Every structure is written in structure tokens, then in C-alpha cells.
Amino acid sequence: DVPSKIGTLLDLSATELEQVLYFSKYIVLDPKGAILNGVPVEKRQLLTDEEYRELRYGKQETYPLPPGVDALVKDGEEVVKGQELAPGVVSRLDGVALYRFPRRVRVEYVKKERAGLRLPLAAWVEKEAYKPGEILAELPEPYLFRAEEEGVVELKELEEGAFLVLRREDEPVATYFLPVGMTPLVVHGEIVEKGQPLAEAKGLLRMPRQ
Amino acid sequence: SDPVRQYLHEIGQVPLLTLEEEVELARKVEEGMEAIKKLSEITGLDPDLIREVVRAKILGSARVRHIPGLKETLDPKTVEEIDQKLKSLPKEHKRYLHIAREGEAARQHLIEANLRLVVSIAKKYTGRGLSFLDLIQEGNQGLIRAVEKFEYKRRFKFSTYATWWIRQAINRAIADQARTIRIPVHMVETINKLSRTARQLQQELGREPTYEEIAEAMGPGWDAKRVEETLKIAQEPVSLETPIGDEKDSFYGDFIPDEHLPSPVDAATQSLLSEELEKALSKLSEREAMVLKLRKGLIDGREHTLEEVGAFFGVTRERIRQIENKALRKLKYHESRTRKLRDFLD
Amino acid sequence: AAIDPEEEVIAEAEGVVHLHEPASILVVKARVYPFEDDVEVSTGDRVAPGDVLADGGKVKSDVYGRVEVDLVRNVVRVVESYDIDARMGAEAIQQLLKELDLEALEKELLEEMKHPSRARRAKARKRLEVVRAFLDSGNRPEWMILEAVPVLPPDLRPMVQVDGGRFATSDLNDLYRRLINRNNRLKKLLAQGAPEIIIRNEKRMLQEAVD
DNA sequence: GCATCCGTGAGTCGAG
DNA sequence: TATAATGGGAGCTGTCACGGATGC
Ligand SMILES: [Mg+2]
């Protein structure tokens, strides 16, 4: 009934009191140090649902990843607005990106083993240890690494470089590690007598990255 | 402005769940309930009280109210006591608290997520005696039942199990509400079945079926009398404000006489009756007049036995009944004489 | 983990885990607080800066926000938010009406009455008439909001059997029934802890029922 | 200051 | 109690005669 008495006492326009009573908009009793768009929230301010959700429950957004496309960012790692989350995705806000329902889980298994290799004494560079990528030796002429045991060959080729494991019956009698720059001359499940070339080292040879 | 559009907008705010998100939320809910159970086993508290406390803390102090099923009044004091005793648990035990909270959050997000399905189901129930929004809210109750009863292990989408409970709650509402005079739900079922039967019969016969035809069509136990009594008992009331005319002038209730309050004529005749009876009772002695007056209950409005009037007048029941007899007899003589009291007999 | 035990993925030997190809990516503004020890706050608790969370108080909160406890990632997360109180409906309005101190508003508007502008003087008068009305009356403004809704005596809204043996009744009965139904449904919806967007709808429908 | 919007009024008895 | 089902429809049109509130 105009002029509204409730609206009059509280200094609220018809539209405002309508919005509050009929649940179009929130009205703030105790801002509790709230801030919206840089300005602090004054008591008896009108907030939409977007604004009240942003203020009270915090801001967030989810973005889809097309199937078979890996994320360009890591779980838990901070992001800046505009920074591309993926080749097809650009984040609208700043914050902590989180992974939602990962399709592929890759497990890197730790392996600590022991393997021998024989090299010409002139070519070798003496070192107490070899870090990845570091040069193991330098060979002036093609050299043939020869088998020091007899048995069946287990050949496993890593990302770069490889491993040979010789076994008689079910028990391995040898383990050789072939670093980068050495081409294996044998295949998996092959029989090698002592002295025949397992591989060929040529030119420089270095440790693999893995 | 339009409440329906507004609610459809608010519903349009929360996005729809992928199969993954759905299964995740479901799982979190179930495991949350399990967590509350185990937590009640550990603490020795009531699983209900615990659930209400966890729920309270998730929703905030914005919603705190006493629950009818709870034996304690639920207020921020008591929920703080309980929450603090929950915070005093060892790491492995205090873990179940976090599980519970996660569960509740998952539940809320689940309901809010699936709110659209309720609308899409209830839009088909319009016109059955309930408002669109009422239907929507009842369907929401159904949705809640679905969430609390759902098991993700069956690898079913949420929609399939939800739809059943939603439809059930809506139907229950329609049955329990839309009649001004409430009728039991089974009875409403019988009435609607009677209606479908009658409509089928009218579609085959090309005319409105008689009571006997419907009786025969309803199988055994149903005669014409049963059909008629069922229809009669199903009769809805009519508005007193229904207009009887072209103009705003006539209301139906304006034609309805009040039978309750006595008419001036009836009142005056009752008065003259009391007066004439006092006239004829004064023609007796005060003792016999008082005995008659106590026996017919003119004094207190109730009739005393022979033992009570005999104990009050200090005579035997035979004696008090005897003076009652002679009083009544003298009254019969006086009435045969003056004939004043004959006209009051209708 | 999975539904059926034989579909589970168990780690054969020692190694580290790498997550690839997420179904989606959720970007949230939040502050991360890793923990090695039993955490003192659970999920849902609201927290200001300088609050104890985990590790017996060693790790605290930098910002204002809401606590999400991650047991999987072993980190307490805080989504930046306030405690801000904002309501809707006649409860909020009843609050604002209760909060009003009349004499203060009277005097403020009196100061407003000396202003040169004609319009402002006018509005100040219009308001002051209301304020002074409530003041001199002895009636509290908050009574303009209803808690207990009165019910008209039945005889004044009859349910009566007419000549034919049929019932005729007043519309106030249907209105009262609407009110009572929506109300009770609200009480049960609250008792069961339904989400917002439900309770909101119910409350709105309740107000429209009373109207 | 002057166009514009929203709510509230628009005869009596009779019969119906 | 479990295939899955995820945003509603009808408006309704030849009165002024306005009153006070609201708007460039
Ligand atoms: Mg039969």
C-alpha cells in the first residue's frame, strides 16, 4: 500500500523491498568485513545471487578438457588470469588449478640395479660417478663390446640406451648396461656364446637422461 | 514478478553433472553416512545427533533448529560441545569427521544439481488439483529421499532411481492435499480407478454408464450400491462465493438459511413453555414441585435418580417416587382441566 | 579404488605417481596449507587470518575463507570468502525493523527538515509522520511483520450442508489450507536440512500464500 | 519543472 | 525402490479518470 510503511521506515524503494521480500536479492545485516569489487560492503546493501555467492562462498570455475588432451599445468600449481590451462583452454581467473577425474595415471617405478660394461682404456674418462647426459667415453674407431658369459639374452631398450641380461636356465648370469652411442647387435631371446659381439660402440658415448 | 520463471532461473544456475561428477558426489555421500555410523560406534553418541551436528556445521549457524526426532534441543551451545568432543578424537578417528563433512557437502551439491529433473517431471502433473510450484516442492522432497536412499554401486545413473521417488512423492501429495475434505490415499486410488473404469466404459458404450455397468466392470464385490456410495463419498464441496448471476450482486451463500440459532418464534414459545410449566408447578406443594423439578432436571439441567432426591428430601426412594407420582397425577388433572399445556405438544 | 576389487589398481613396486589427462580442470581462488600432522579444523569451518588449523598450530591461515580439508592431498585448503551475513525475506526485514531506534530517526529527520531543498524537506516530513505515528502510538514497527497468523472463527467461514446433502464452504478455508500446507512443508524441509534454492522457493511460496 | 506508470474508483430496489 | 529420463506455459486485446509516485 503506497507509500509503503515498511518501505518508508527503512528507506527502501518499492522495487527494493519487493526484491528482498520475494527473494530476488539479499540484504546485508552484518558485512563482517566483506569486500566486493574493491569497495568494502556497507550495511543494508543489495546483492544479487552472483555477488552473494562470490562473497560468501568464494569464486571458482571449471573448464572442460577434450578427450585425449593433456593439461599444460600441474595439479596444485598456481595460475594467473589469461594463462592457458591447456592448448584449447584459457583460465579466466587467478588461483590454484586442480585436476578433475584424471583419465591416465602414470607411475614411475624406481629401479636400483648393478650392471657392467667393458671399454678400451684410452677411450674411457675416469669418473667416480656419471650423471645423466654426461659423457662416459670417446672412441676413435668402431669398437665391439663382447659377451663375457654364455646364455640367453634379455634385451630391454629404455627411452635411450638399453640393458642386456644373460641367463643360463632360469638364473641370470650377466647384466650389461649399454649407454647412448652403442647399437645393440642382438635381439630378445637370442643365444650368445662367450666372445661374440653384443653391440657396437661408435664415436662418442654418453649416459641416457632417464 | 513470475515465481516460476524465477525458480527456473535459480535452477538454471547450477550446472548439470557429468557421469564422473555424479558418481563422485554419490560415493562421497554414501561413505559419509558410513563415516557417521563408525563415528557413532567410536563416540557412543546418537548417529542422528551426530548427523545433525555435522550438517549444522556444513550449512553454518544460519540454519540451527530443534529436530523432533532428537532428544536434545539443538542450539549453537550444544552443537559446539558436540563438535568439540568430535575434535578431541585421535587422528584416525578424527578422520571420520572430515569424511562426514565431505559427505554432507556432496549431498547438498547433489540435490541442487538434480533439481531440474523434478521440474521436468512435475510439469506433466499440472491440473490435478495442485499448483505447479507445490508439485515442484513435493518432487523436491522425493528427490531428497532418492539422494538419501541411492547406491552408486549398481552403476545406474541418478535419474533412474530419482524419478521413482519423485513421482511417488508428487502422487502422494496430490492424493493427500487437493481435496478440501481430506480422503485417505487408498480411497483416492479406488475413486480414480472407478473414474478410469467409467471413462473406458463410456468410450466403449458411447454413453455414460449406469451404476450397474460400472459395478460389473469393477469385478466382484462391486454392486450398484457400492458404486453409488463411492461416488457420493467422493463429492467435493462447492464455494459459498460462487455467483448466481450475471452481475456481482448474487452470492450462493446468500440463499442459505441458518438452522442453528433458534428463531424468535421458537424462543418465545420456549419462554412461554417455561412460564406455563412454572404456572402448573406452583399449583403443587413446594416439596412435590421440587421433586418433579429435580427428577426432570429443570433445576440443574440434569435428572437425579430416586436415591438422590430421596436422600435430599430425607425419604425412601419408594416414597419420593410416590410423591413424584401424585405430583404428576395432580398435573394431569390440572391439564385435563385448564388445557393450557396442550398447545405446546406440537 | 573401484567398485569391484579385481578392477582396482595396486602398486607393484616402489615408485612415484603422476596424474595426466584430467577429465576437466577446476580453477579456484584459494590458499594452500600442507600438513604433516593431525589437523584441528574439519571441512566447512569458516576461518579468518591468524587462525589455528593444523600441526598443533604451526600452520595458520593467511586469508579470510572457508576450509576444505584434503586428506588425499594431505593439505588444508582455504577458499577465500567472508563470514558476511546477508538475508532475504520478512525475517531480514523484521530484523531491520527491530534494530530501528525511533527517537534517533526522529531527530535525524528533524535535522533533515532544516535542509534548503524542498524535496528533501518533503520526504523527511513523509517519513517523520510514520515514525512519529509509531512513536506516539506505542506500536512496534516489527509488528508489520507476521509470526503468528491469526485464524478466523469457523462459524464465520462455514462448512455447511445444504438442502441436497451437499457441502458448501468459504474460500478462506482453501486459502488457510494453502498456507498451512506450505508452512508444514517448510517445517519438514527445514527439519531435513534441504539446500538453499529449495528453502528459498518454499519461503517465497509461503509469503505469497499469506498474501 | 513535465511526461509516464500503477492502483482504484465508476447509482438504487427487484430476480438471479 | 534402480534401462535413462535434468528450465512452464498462456497470454487475450474498443473505460477514463484519474490520483499521487517515479524519471530525463
Ligand atoms: Mg460386480
From TrEMBL, chain B:
<feature type="binding site">
    <location>
        <position position="219"/>
    </location>
    <ligand>
        <name>Mg(2+) 7</name>
    </ligand>
</feature>
<feature type="binding site">
    <location>
        <position position="343"/>
    </location>
    <ligand>
        <name>Mg(2+) 11</name>
    </ligand>
</feature>
<keyword id="KW-0804">Transcription</keyword>
<feature type="short sequence motif" description="Interaction with polymerase core subunit RpoC">
    <location>
        <begin position="134"/>
        <end position="137"/>
    </location>
</feature>
<dbReference type="GO" id="GO:0046872">
    <property type="term" value="F:metal ion binding"/>
</dbReference>
<dbReference type="GO" id="GO:0003677">
    <property type="term" value="F:DNA binding"/>
</dbReference>
<feature type="binding site">
    <location>
        <position position="222"/>
    </location>
    <ligand>
        <name>Mg(2+) 7</name>
    </ligand>
</feature>
<keyword id="KW-0479">Metal-binding</keyword>
<feature type="binding site">
    <location>
        <position position="222"/>
    </location>
    <ligand>
        <name>Mg(2+) 5</name>
    </ligand>
</feature>
<feature type="DNA-binding region" description="H-T-H motif">
    <location>
        <begin position="306"/>
        <end position="325"/>
    </location>
</feature>
<feature type="binding site">
    <location>
        <position position="215"/>
    </location>
    <ligand>
        <name>Mg(2+) 4</name>
    </ligand>
</feature>
<dbReference type="GO" id="GO:0005737">
    <property type="term" value="C:cytoplasm"/>
</dbReference>
<comment type="similarity">
    <text>Belongs to the sigma-70 factor family. RpoD/SigA subfamily.</text>
</comment>
<protein>
    <recommendedName>
        <fullName>RNA polymerase sigma factor SigA</fullName>
    </recommendedName>
</protein>
<feature type="binding site">
    <location>
        <position position="72"/>
    </location>
    <ligand>
        <name>Mg(2+) 1</name>
    </ligand>
</feature>
<comment type="subunit">
    <text>Interacts transiently with the RNA polymerase catalytic core.</text>
</comment>
<keyword id="KW-0963">Cytoplasm</keyword>
<feature type="binding site">
    <location>
        <position position="249"/>
    </location>
    <ligand>
        <name>Mg(2+) 10</name>
    </ligand>
</feature>
<feature type="binding site">
    <location>
        <position position="219"/>
    </location>
    <ligand>
        <name>Mg(2+) 3</name>
    </ligand>
</feature>
<dbReference type="GO" id="GO:0006352">
    <property type="term" value="P:DNA-templated transcription initiation"/>
</dbReference>
<feature type="binding site">
    <location>
        <position position="88"/>
    </location>
    <ligand>
        <name>Mg(2+) 2</name>
    </ligand>
</feature>
<feature type="region of interest" description="Sigma-70 factor domain-2">
    <location>
        <begin position="110"/>
        <end position="180"/>
    </location>
</feature>
<feature type="binding site">
    <location>
        <position position="222"/>
    </location>
    <ligand>
        <name>Mg(2+) 8</name>
    </ligand>
</feature>
<feature type="binding site">
    <location>
        <position position="219"/>
    </location>
    <ligand>
        <name>Mg(2+) 6</name>
    </ligand>
</feature>
<feature type="binding site">
    <location>
        <position position="219"/>
    </location>
    <ligand>
        <name>Mg(2+) 4</name>
    </ligand>
</feature>
<feature type="binding site">
    <location>
        <position position="340"/>
    </location>
    <ligand>
        <name>Mg(2+) 11</name>
    </ligand>
</feature>
<feature type="binding site">
    <location>
        <position position="215"/>
    </location>
    <ligand>
        <name>Mg(2+) 3</name>
    </ligand>
</feature>
<feature type="binding site">
    <location>
        <position position="215"/>
    </location>
    <ligand>
        <name>Mg(2+) 5</name>
    </ligand>
</feature>
<keyword id="KW-0805">Transcription regulation</keyword>
<dbReference type="GO" id="GO:0016987">
    <property type="term" value="F:sigma factor activity"/>
</dbReference>
<keyword id="KW-0731">Sigma factor</keyword>
<feature type="binding site">
    <location>
        <position position="246"/>
    </location>
    <ligand>
        <name>Mg(2+) 9</name>
    </ligand>
</feature>
<feature type="domain" description="RNA polymerase sigma-70">
    <location>
        <begin position="305"/>
        <end position="331"/>
    </location>
</feature>
<feature type="binding site">
    <location>
        <position position="222"/>
    </location>
    <ligand>
        <name>Mg(2+) 4</name>
    </ligand>
</feature>
<comment type="function">
    <text>Sigma factors are initiation factors that promote the attachment of RNA polymerase to specific initiation sites and are then released. This sigma factor is the primary sigma factor during exponential growth.</text>
</comment>
<keyword id="KW-0238">DNA-binding</keyword>
